Structures are given as structure tokens and as C-alpha cells.
Amino acid sequence: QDTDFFSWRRTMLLRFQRMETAEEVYHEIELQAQQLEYDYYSLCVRHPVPFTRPKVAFYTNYPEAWVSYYQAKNFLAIDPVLNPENFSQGHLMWNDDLFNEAQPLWEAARAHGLRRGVTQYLMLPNRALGFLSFSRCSAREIPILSDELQLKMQLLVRESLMALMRLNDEIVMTPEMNFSKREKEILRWTAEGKTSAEIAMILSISENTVNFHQKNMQKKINAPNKTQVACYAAATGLIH
Amino acid sequence: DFFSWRRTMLLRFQRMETAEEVYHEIELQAQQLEYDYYSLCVRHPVPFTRPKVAFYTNYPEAWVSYYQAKNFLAIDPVLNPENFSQGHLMWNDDLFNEAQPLWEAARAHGLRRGVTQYLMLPNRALGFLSFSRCSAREIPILSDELQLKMQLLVRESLMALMRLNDEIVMTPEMNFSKREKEILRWTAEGKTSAEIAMILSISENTVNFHQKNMQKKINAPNKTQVACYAAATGLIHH
Numbered sequence A: 001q002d003t004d005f006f007s008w009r010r011t012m013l014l015r016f017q018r019m020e021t022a023e024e025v026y027h028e029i030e031l032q033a034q035q036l037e038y039d040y041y042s043l044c045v046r047h048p049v050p051f052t053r054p055k056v057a058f059y060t061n062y063p064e065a066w067v068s069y070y071q072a073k074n075f076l077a078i079d080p081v082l083n084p085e086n087f088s089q090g091h092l093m094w095n096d097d098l099f100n101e102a103q104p105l106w107e108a109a110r111a112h113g114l115r116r117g118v119t120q121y122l123m124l125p126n127r128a129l130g131f132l133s134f135s136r137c138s139a140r141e142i143p144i145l146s147d148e149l150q151l152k153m154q155l156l157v158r159e160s161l162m163a164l165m166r167l168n169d170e171i172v173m174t175p176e177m178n179f180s181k182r183e184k185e186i187l188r189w190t191a192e193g194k195t196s197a198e199i200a201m202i203l204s205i206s207e208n209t210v211n212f213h214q215k216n217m218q219k220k221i222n223a224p225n226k227t228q229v230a231c232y233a234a235a236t237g238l239i240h
Numbered sequence B: 001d002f003f004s005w006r007r008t009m010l011l012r013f014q015r016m017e018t019a020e021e022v023y024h025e026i027e028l029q030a031q032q033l034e035y036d037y038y039s040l041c042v043r044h045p046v047p048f049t050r051p052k053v054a055f056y057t058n059y060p061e062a063w064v065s066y067y068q069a070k071n072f073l074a075i076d077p078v079l080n081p082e083n084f085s086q087g088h089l090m091w092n093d094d095l096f097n098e099a100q101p102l103w104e105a106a107r108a109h110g111l112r113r114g115v116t117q118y119l120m121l122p123n124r125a126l127g128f129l130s131f132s133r134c135s136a137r138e139i140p141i142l143s144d145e146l147q148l149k150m151q152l153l154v155r156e157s158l159m160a161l162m163r164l165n166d167e168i169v170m171t172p173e174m175n176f177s178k179r180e181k182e183i184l185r186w187t188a189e190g191k192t193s194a195e196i197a198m199i200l201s202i203s204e205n206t207v208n209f210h211q212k213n214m215q216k217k218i219n220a221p222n223k224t225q226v227a228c229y230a231a232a233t234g235l236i237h238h
């Protein structure tokens, strides 16, 4: 069983690498969640921007009654399952003590039929945090162990979100920034604190064009000034 | 039986209290895998034009000195994520086609075979673990188990080094107050000092004092560099 995991990995990588539809990824998440005796799955992504109220997108086969309930009560703001501080090796076991500061969410979950669950998370190249949760409606498997699950989940989180990025799904995709290589170079220098006057000296071009590219750079994102553009670029790693 | 290796390593690294213990454990694990030398390198996300790079290795002092003198960090393919797949890289001749001088100097100093694993850290820093041997003896391992074994080693060692605030992995220190970071978040949204003053209901003078004080402890020209560095390291959305 040490070997059939390694091959499982290789099929999985190949499956996910060559998937051409978003609905195929979620399909595979669902297939695997079932093979592992979980009824419900949930794939959640926290974006790095906007800095003040960053967007959160999700996809789940949860009972819609609970989804509607979950949103209505604003449970996202207090769900420990979406807090990386609570994880270990990117893994998290649901238990009663975990919901010590969010009692309303936990019993409400019990009431809707979510008794046991597990969550895996990782960070993506666009700096967005992705969270995959599994849940079942039978009391079971409290002490998991279960190292193969963690590893199975480790992979299922990564490649699905990796597949979804290749497919430009907005659940995972950050704001589009197709900049000329020259335009991006000026940004690296803007983030270093250089004035258009100062940037002009080093790159040997007119200050008229520096100011021109900046506004053109701001066009394709529609930001007020050079500061927001640099920060969005830096927050996503486009500039490094 | 591997899962037991996984679990022991996790226990080891979680209970480490010292940096030399992290580097010692790396040294052992590299040697159990029939590798002589290890090298742990970290490229920080900032500054944007000349990003900071620190490393720690048990390479021969002679080779390390030569490597630095010829400025090989600037052209090392082993430190270029584009050459990786699933975060893994086996060293081969074609890899150094655009850095033959490095490869030739490396062979001359006794580095015959090697392999590298990398990941991104929570501060967006890129960590690189390399193993290398002077033997080949071209060797026997299921590459899949190696990749997985190395994946754990890169991760847990650097996370351990972060708990210990080791200088190799800790970014330039930026201890900002919760108030200071609120102002940064708003600066990053493109807000002027006046608008931040209204939103937080404090004087533009205190906005500016906080603004100048953050620039003091970072040695920054203006508020733009401070905001971008903060965004680039995740100080704002940790």
C-alpha cells in the first residue's frame, strides 16, 4: 500500500494536469470524497485582495439549507476551519474543542447533519489560500491517524486548485494583469520608491513615457494611482 | 512503513529547539539517502530588484568560497523555479546549458550528482533544499519516495527555522502595530493620507506620523515602498 499510493499520485497528477473542464475537477473531488466515505465536500478559496475586504469564493455539495443558513448567519467570519493558525502540516481534524469560540456554528452543523469532518489547506502561487473540507453524516473515525488521508487530501487540494488556475476559473483567479515586460519593470522600480524622474534616469527614457505607461498600466486595472497598482502586483507575486 | 518515517520526522521537527539541530537532521537524512552534501537556500520576495538570498550548507569551504566569488547565485538554475516540476529537480547536463561555467567549476570541486526540492513559505520566500554526492555509483532509489521524502524535509526544516526566528528565513524585520497595518492596508488600496484620516477618524497628522515612523524602521524613501514590501511578504493578509 506504500506503492499503490505512489501510483495513485501519478494517475491523479496526470488526470488533473490534462483536465479541460472545471466541472471535471469538482467531479473528481466528489469521486474521491466518496471513496473515502464522506458524503459532503467543500472547496473554498481566500483571495489576497482586496486588502481591506478580500474576496472568498467556494464550491460545495453541502445541503443547500445549511449553505443558505451558513451565509445568513455570516459564519465565514468565525469559521476556525478557514483559519490557517489552526492547522498543522496543512491539516485539521474537526473536534468539539476546535469550536470553543464558535459554538453557534458547531451545533448548527450537528443539527443539519454534519457530525464529523476534516480540512486540508495550502497556499497557491497567486498567494490565495485554498481550503478543502470533507464531512460525513455518521459518527466515525475520531482519531483518524490517518496519514494516508492527510497525504491524499494534501494532493487533492493542490492539483484541483492547480487545475482550476490552468483553466482560469475565477474561484481561484486573481485580477488580470497582462503588462508589457517594460511596464512591469517600471513597477518593480515604483515599488522600490522611485519617482518617474528617477526611473527615467536609470532606464534611459523620457519622463513623458514613464507617466504614460503608468496611466496605461492603470487603465488595464482601473486603479486611481501608481500605489494601488504596485501593491496589487506585489500581493500576487506578479512582480516576483 | 513510510508513513512511520513521515510521522517520526514530524515529531522530530516539531520538538526541535535549536537551529543546529535542524541542520543536523538535514545532514543525517541526506546521508541516509546516499548523499554527501546538503544546501539550504532561501530567496526572499524583497527587495523587488535585488531580492535577498541567504543559505546554509555543509559544502566544502573551498567550493562555497569559489561559488560566491564568481557570483553564481545570480545564474544558478537549481534556484530557478521554472526548471522544476512538482517542486522537484534532478540535476542533469542540459540544465546547465546556459551556466556551463558553474557546472564545470562544480565538477572540478567534486560534485557529480545532485537533486533539489523547493517550496514557497508563508512570507512568500522561496526555500531550496539541494542534496548532492561526489559518488556515482549512479544510484538506486524510487524517485517518487525521494521526492516525497525531500518535500517533507524542505517544508518542516524551514518551518522549524521560522519558529526559531532564524536569520536565513526571517524577512527583514517589520514589526508594525495593528494600527500601522490598518494604515498600510488602506495605503495599498490607493487611499491618500486625508482619506485614511477620515476612515479611521484620526488626524492626517497622526496618519503621517505613523507613515513616517514605519519608513524610519525600514529605511524607506516614501510610503509606496513600505506598502509594497508589506504586500509582497503577506504581512497584511497573514
Ligand SMILES: CCCC(=O)CC(=O)N[C@H]1CCOC1=O
Residues within 6 Å of the ligand: A042, A043, A044, A058, A060, A070, A079, A081, A082, A105, A106, A109, A114, A131, A133
Ligand atoms: C461554504 C462552506 C465554508 C467552508 O468551505 C468551510 C467549511 O466547510 N466549514 C465547515 C465547518 C462546519 O460547518 C462547515 O461548513
Ligand SMILES: CCCC(=O)CC(=O)N[C@H]1CCOC1=O
Residues within 6 Å of the ligand: B039, B040, B041, B055, B057, B059, B067, B076, B078, B079, B102, B106, B111, B114, B130
Ligand atoms: C550554497 C550554494 C548555492 C546553493 O545553495 C544552490 C546549490 O546547491 N547549487 C549547487 C548546484 C551546482 O553547484 C552547487 O553547489
